[PDB]
Design a protein around this ligand. Structure first.
Ligand SMILES: O=C(O)CNC(=O)C(=O)O
Ligand SMILES: [Mn+2]
Ligand SMILES: [Mn+2]
Ligand SMILES: [Zn+2]
Ligand SMILES: [Zn+2]
Length: 450
């Protein structure tokens, strides 16, 4: 009546054979898990990476969080892990007037949703979210016995997933620190993460190292726009376009609201030693049951490539900033075709064929607008902020239009009419590759793939 919990998401318990390769496993579960957005993976019972750290030497600056449904929050003092933990336990213990392990998870969940709905209640909490630095540090072992060395090179060690052969993000040489370095999340009771999807609609994978559970809600990829439509109606303030990457607006929203509007929603409690995986464009949110320590990272498989391209197109329509150029990633991999995995090479080839055919058509269109002059340009050398379309903010790589009347400004080939009021004959087509350069790059991939 008050809170009706969503149905449980899938839980997987892979054998050690299945667990050996994450990407094969993730590919295996995808048909199930993509229908629910999120899933939970329990490793085999003896897969137990050692957590070790000094609670007095780990220092961080907490974010403060007000707990109000539909209120705007932006997506991205000082505590030690010890002093945070003391604050966190005391908070929950006083809130419920009980010892922490006695507080049932169903009650914290019920109470979270009551609390965020009531305006008279104005509970604020704190949490930690930051990338590993020399102060933060991964919860997994890194280089700085057979078992303790095993965890160093495990695929499920989240330092390795991004820079493994099979994250297409591995091959990016651009700075994308938010997207291949793990994030560390130090939770307390009710600290929450707002509804979101990952940058470039990537996967995320999250491991709870220790402490009390993290409660998750997830929506499958196919329902993303339904969720957004429900959200736009209840909170249009969140949909006013953002002036930069560091101003993304997100919110807490009761999954029963979504379920009322027939958006499918699933839940889980992730406990210590369990993984949650979010699939491309799968909206998720949640909150911590209490004091805990999690670590998460983005990644991209071969299954993701075409969604990556759709995502960049969707960003263009919304005028949203990109973290990296997708076309630049594809060409970088083409230029390394000899050393790519052959299934990777095969999938890159297929995305590259679409890129080339779209680029060919776009160039024909701008030639017919009267843009005649052209010059090669190494777009990858420009900082990002010097190669965004004035109009749609897309990060340019394949091509752009410039005019000497506005030095340094560019539009992509969709926005040729948006640069300035000079006639198009004054413009230059700036291009990274001729069509004749591109066909042999794609062919190198074909050869690698057999
Ligand atoms: O754990 C959190 O607090 C937030 N994590 C995520 O959004 C994720 O892992 O994709
Ligand atoms: Mn409130
Ligand atoms: Mn996330
Ligand atoms: Zn544009
Ligand atoms: Zn001009």
């Amino acid at each position: 009546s008050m809170f009706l919990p969503p149905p449980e998401c899938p839980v997987f318990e892979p054998s050690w054979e299945e667990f050996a390769d994450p990407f094969a496993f993730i590919h295996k579960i995808r048909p199930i898990a993509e229908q629910t957005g999120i899933c939970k993976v329990r490793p085999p019972p003896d897969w137990q990476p050692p957590f070790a750290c000094d609670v007095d030497k780990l220092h961080f600056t907490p974010r403060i969080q007000r707990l109000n449904e539909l209120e705007a929050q932006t997506r991205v003092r000082d505590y030690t892990l010890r002093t945070f933990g003391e604050m966190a336990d005391a908070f929950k213990s006083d809130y419920f007037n009980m010892p922490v392990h006695m507080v049932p998870t169903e009650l914290v969940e019920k109470e979270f949703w009551r609390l965020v709905s009531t305006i008279e209640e104005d509970v604020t909490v704190e949490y930690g979210a930051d990338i590993a630095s020399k102060e933060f540090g991964s919860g997994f072992p890194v280089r700085d016995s057979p078992e303790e060395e095993e965890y160093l090179d495990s695929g499920w060690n989240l330092n390795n997933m991004p820079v493994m052969e099979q994250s297409v993000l591995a091959h990016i040489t651009a700075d994308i620190c938010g997207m291949k370095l793990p994030w560390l999340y130090v939770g307390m009771c009710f600290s929450s993460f707002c509804w979101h999807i990952e940058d470039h609609w990537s996967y995320s994978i999250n491991y709870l190292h220790w402490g009390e559970p993290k409660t998750w809600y997830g929506v499958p990829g196919y329902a993303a726009e339904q969720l957004e439509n429900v959200m736009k109606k209840l909170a249009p303030e969140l949909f006013v376009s953002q002036p930069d990457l560091l101003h993304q607006l997100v919110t807490i929203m009761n999954p029963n609201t979504l379920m009322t509007h027939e958006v499918p929603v699933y839940r889980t409690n992730q406990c210590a030693g369990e993984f949650v995986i979010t699939f491309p464009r799968a909206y998720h949110s949640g909150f911590n049951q209490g004091f805990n320590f999690a670590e998460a990272v983005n990644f991209c498989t071969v299954d993701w490539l075409p969604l990556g391209r759709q995502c960049v197109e969707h960003y263009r329509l919304l005028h949203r900033y990109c973290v990296f150029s997708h076309d630049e990633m594809i060409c970088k991999m083409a230029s390394k075709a000899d050393v790519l995995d052959v299934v990777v090479a095969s999938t890159v080839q297929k995305d590259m064929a679409i890129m080339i055919e779209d680029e060919k058509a776009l160039r024909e269109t701008v030639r017919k607008l009267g843009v005649i002059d052209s010059e090669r340009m190494d777009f990858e050398l420009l900082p990002d902020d010097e190669r965004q379309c004035v109009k749609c903010k897309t990060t340019c790589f394949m091509s752009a239009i410039s005019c000497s009347c506005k030095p340094g400004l560019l539009v992509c080939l969709h926005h040729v009419k948006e640069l300035c009021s000079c006639p198009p004959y004054k413009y230059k087509l700036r291009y990274r590759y001729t069509l004749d350069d591109l066909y042999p790059m794609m062919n190198a991939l074909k050869l690698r793939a057999e």
